[PDB]
Amino acid sequence: MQALEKELAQNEWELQALEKELAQLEKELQAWNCICDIENCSNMAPLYSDQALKKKLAQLKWKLQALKKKNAQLKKKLQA
């Protein structure tokens, strides 16, 4: 019960790592600005918008609808 459930708990941890990946965004989003902004040199131009965030989230949540339904499938595959 530690191979699947802990792979699921690891997938939960990948989910936590998905939350931590989510928190990685906030690590990109929140951990980037605290009080003052610094000057850095970049080669590529970032996007960071509403149709790219809340949509990539709405696509993520849409991915959940699939993943959570896959986690519900996994929760379906958990017991059954």
Report how far apart, in Å, the C-alpha atoms of 69 and of each of 32, 48, 52, 63 are. Answer: 33, 28, 23, 9
**Interatomic CA distance for residues 80 and 65, integer angstroms:** 20
Asked if the 1-43 domain carries CATH number 3.40.1410.10, the reply is: no
Domain ranges of the chain: 1-43, 44-80
Report how far apart, in Å, the C-alpha atoms of 42 and of each of 24, 27, 28, 39, 45 are. Answer: 20, 18, 15, 10, 7
**Interatomic CA distance for residues 56 and 72, integer angstroms:** 21
**Interatomic CA distance for residues 59 and 16, integer angstroms:** 18
Structure tokens that stand for 46 in this block: 């970032």
**Interatomic CA distance for residues 26 and 1, integer angstroms:** 33
